[PDB]
Amino acid sequence: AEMAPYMKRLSRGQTVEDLLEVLSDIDEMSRRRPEILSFFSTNLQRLMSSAEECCRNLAFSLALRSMQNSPSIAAAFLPTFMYCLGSQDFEVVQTALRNLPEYALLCQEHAAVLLHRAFLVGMYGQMDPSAQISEALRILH
Amino acid sequence: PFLDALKNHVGELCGETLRLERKRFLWQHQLLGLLSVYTRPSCGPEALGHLLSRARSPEELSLATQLYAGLVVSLSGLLPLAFRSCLARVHAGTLQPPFTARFLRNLALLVGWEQQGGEGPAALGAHFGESASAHLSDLAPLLLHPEEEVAEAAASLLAICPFPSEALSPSQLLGLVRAGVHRFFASLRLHGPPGVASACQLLTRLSQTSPAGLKAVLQLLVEGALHRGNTELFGGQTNRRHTAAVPGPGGIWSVFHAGVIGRGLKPPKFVQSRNQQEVIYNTQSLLSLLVHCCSAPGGTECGECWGAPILSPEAAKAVAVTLVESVCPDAAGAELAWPPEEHARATVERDLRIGRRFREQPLLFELLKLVAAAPPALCYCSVLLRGLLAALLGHWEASRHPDTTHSPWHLEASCTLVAVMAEGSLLPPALGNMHEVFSQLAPFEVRLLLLSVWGFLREHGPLPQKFIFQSERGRFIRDFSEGGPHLAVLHSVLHRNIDRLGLFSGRF
Amino acid sequence: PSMHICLDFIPELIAQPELEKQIFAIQLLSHLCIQYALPKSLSVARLAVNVMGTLLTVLTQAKRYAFFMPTLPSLVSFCRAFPPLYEDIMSLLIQIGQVCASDVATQTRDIDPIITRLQQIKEKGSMDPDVQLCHCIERTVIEIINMSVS
Amino acid sequence: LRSGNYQEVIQIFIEDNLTLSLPVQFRQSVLRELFKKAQQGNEALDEICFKVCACNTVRDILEGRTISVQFNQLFLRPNKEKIDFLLEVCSRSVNLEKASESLKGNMAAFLKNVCLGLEDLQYVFMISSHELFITLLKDEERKLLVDQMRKRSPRVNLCIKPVTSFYDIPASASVNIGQLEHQLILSVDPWRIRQILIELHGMTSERQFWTVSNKWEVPSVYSGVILGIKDNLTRDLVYILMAKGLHCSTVKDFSHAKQLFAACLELVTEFSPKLRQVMLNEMLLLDIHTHEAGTGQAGERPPSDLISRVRGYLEMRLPDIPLRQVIAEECVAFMLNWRENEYLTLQVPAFLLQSNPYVKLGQLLAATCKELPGPKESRRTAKDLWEVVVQICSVSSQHKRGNDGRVSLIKQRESTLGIMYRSELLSFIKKLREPLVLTIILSLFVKLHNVREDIVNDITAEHISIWPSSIPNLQSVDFEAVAITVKELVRYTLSINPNNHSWLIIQADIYFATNQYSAALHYYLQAGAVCSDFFNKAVPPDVYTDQVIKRMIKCCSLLNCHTQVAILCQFLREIDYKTAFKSLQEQNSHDAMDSYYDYIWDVTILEYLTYLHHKRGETDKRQIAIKAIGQTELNASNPEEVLQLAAQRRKKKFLQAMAKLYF
Known part of the structure; x- marks a missing residue:
């Protein structure tokens, strides 16, 4: 119930500055007890394939922290990650490919198709x- | 806590709503609506995707429309998020080929229902087409999906899906053109003539958007029908055995032979015998697609009751250009001015390769019939005509048979070439009678007539000028300011064979 | 059991002007590495990977296809037997892939495997040689990933 | 004899016999003659021309030959009598299903493959009307035919009314009020809303019914006045109407929002004029949104009524009604997009003009945009725009009064003195749809971006660059914010219309400045496909200059594509052989070296390739290079009328191959 203004700002926010401020607030507040990051899954998935650089990096960091805290949610970020690898912008695919090792280690069940699409994009x-x-x-041995 | 716990079962909730029961489905739909209104993410895209992904009857589509009408009063922006989530699941391992095919066909049905009508899509603002046009980059790779159901669904969806405010992006346009021509060729290979309607409609709709798109469509369609693949559709195309029979049957001397040269007895030795029927109908469908592409719009009921749309000169010019580029990419003698006769004695290799390309694929001739429709279009595809005429002249010069029927393909190609270059507003009807009387003429007589044709084309060369525009229609009329010596040679040839060509004289 | 001695003339079999001898040497070394695991075997496998990578830029398309069609399962088995080679192989594969990415776009095709980038593998006829090489590269990468992940 | 005697009907009757004993060459010749006589002006019975064309087509399909293009050209748009005559000719041949055994199959195949088009089902019904078909099409088989013909263009009926499963007359109060408020929430028509609200007010106590939905977010600017009403019914009605109208305007539902606002205004006519002016401003904003999006993006000219209304509303400013910040920027963008440059700053320049920054920026932009046809070297308005833009995106306190870091303009959002913030201008430009204004803003921002922002000298050039080069207070400005906003503006102006070579070149240059070579080449090829039609013609010299080709070479060099570099080194006015020989010397290419030698028309590059292949012992590619040299097209001795054509053809082929490679 205490996360109402943050969700309202993430849903009604359209400018880069407001979204960046909200993401930085969530990141600085998630130093200890990152379980709260499990309450912003949809917003992080929507902001993951963002045209901005800093906002996309913050969203990726928050998603990786939430997946490291609870690996059971790592299976929920499967589509939104693939959309990062199949976009015609060359910007978000770079960050997705850089975060590919950590996400593939955290997934452990869908790493095959992740690496397959990564090699296809690289070829x-x-x-x-x-x-x-x-x-x-x-790492996967 | 009740709705917070039911949020994790929206999939099974939608599955139970789609059962179409007596009364349980109404209560479950109201529960889904209340759950979508309550939570902050609103579960709109997820629920809409779960409803549209496993919909088989129009009742499920009606339920989804009712849900959207009930949620649009409280929420906003549900179609883009739902489409994005569905496409992200399709590109991933989720949304199995049947599920994504059902989703695509349901989306196509929704777009079709939104297009027509005056009370359905008007009383409920949804903009299915406007929301689906922003996903052409993701719907394009689905045309070449290995599953036929998903490919057909994506083809039926893109055939009616409109375009955004902007025209198109060049990358998106090229991708759409490539996917469309690939789907058209695959459907011609698998389904055949009666299963290409979606691809032809999509190509005709996206070709009339910009001249660059039309040129790209025509170029890719011409290059796809002449490639090594998909060409038989339109026109046509170790020691144990050596040890059991060794030692020369003597076990004390060497072998009888002295080795092999290459391999010998070529295994394949295959001949093109696919089919005779149902092959010309593929060519008919391709020519119909090309006509739909080049004909400018179109559909204004011209004339009184026999309105015939003219062919755009730019489209036919692009078709002729890509045909010349595909047949003979050489440019040593690509000038429009016809060189003299002796000049044909130096480029005999190019003429022979052009003749071989024409004899291996008859579709080229049909393509010429598309270029001969527009008057100024045949003036650009002159290299092919020159090479074919030179090859025919070289064949008739070295023909020992006293009758023309001994070489059927050469006579057929001669008549077809003369008819094409005559109907392209380049030759008087005397040449139209000449290619008619070619049926029973001597080989040297045909050679002399083709040499007179070469001389006339050298004198009155096919040029982009002398084709002034007419204020009546878009047709380019050529006013001949005809050939004296050519008509004299034709009359002499006709008079030397009066005993067999007597009735052909009164025609001209 | 006396096949390991063949290693002692595997490099000599590679330095041959015939492509068939090189392909056979690569395949024999692949089988010897998937059977025997020795530091000498690792060195010979690294030398084979190097000589295969240097042959990509000195062979024409008609020879590149015939040389890289049978020798990709050799790289798969090299990855299965020698983990530390992974990166190298991957890099090599990438290079070859990019080469194919420039060979398909040169001349018009019928299947257009360029748009097939956003496709998945489906468990488990007459086409273009470049498209066949692309499909073989993709398949071998898929097998390498499935072997390393499982 | 009938054709020479100007008797077309006799010729059509004689040619419609299909006696199978006639020269097809003479028939095709007379058909072409009739076509030429009908297309040369003063057509003579074009109906007979269509008739003889149909006879020739049916004879050709019955003999077993292909269908000519004239049949398709004539049947592209058929009608009743056309199909009638086609069916009459198709059923008037020789040996009508008596002893043919071979023409029946051809007839069936032609009738099956002739219905591939004919999007109108009436034509299919007319075809299947005569004897229910011609030759019955092997009956018990047309089921799948009509099935696929109906499935090609289906038509279904759906419902719009929501699921109102609540039974009427529940003989209770709580469930009745619940159903009533649910219907009120699901109600759109203002009459039903008013009826439900007055029924609730009559059946219940004096309790408010406007707080029955948390999704109705009314701005706080009008919330303090919307609640200052004595009567509860009127305030509830006006609140519900305003909330529903705003929600419909947000969802792009102007069809109902117009009626809602009209009913609300009619109800307020008897109330205080404050709410009347509020609803008038809301209706003005709704009409602006409708004229900008509802009527279509390809607008020709407004009816000059809403324009005068907006002008008067902006000019009076008499009452104390609280103006909304969104309406001001909306009307300023509406005035700026429809080319209203005649309304310059000379009109009403001091009556509360410097207070509102939206109108000030709009007037200054309209003044600096019309200075291009003013060839006098004044550019005063351009200097004012540059100064205000560099002062908005700069830090107010150079001593960093906030903190030690550099989060002033990125995170703190303060220290942005001027007229607006750094994000308000973004929302203002996003409401602008005009090529000239957008390209002027983009040129200004890209000029402000390449002023001592880094060490490398990759200055992204632009067509319109007349801004001053002197940068005052180069430390207070934020280069990162400028880069972010120029990237956002490029993305927006590309999302508006990607068919613009200048903006694509700007995007490619920006990507090249950020060490993004693949996307740079992608956008370069995109601009090339925009200017020239998919590289079918020669690219203009101003779109692909020497700098653009040099940047392409730089992108392909660091992309491990050396043969592509060697090919691109020929597009210049003077071939740079140094970089070509430097790139061809590498041995780590990723661009199918042996497959790009056909695109090289230069004898020097091919000679160097042959020498390099002979030096390294690569005979397989050396022979290919020699065979490419020994071509007749390129000889370095042609009269230049042949070398230019081959060069252009190879350029087209290489550019199309590279466009097929990328994106």
């Missing part, structure tokens, strides 16, 4: 995602 799209998938395969 068709002009880039070199060698180190990321290498670290993913080394």
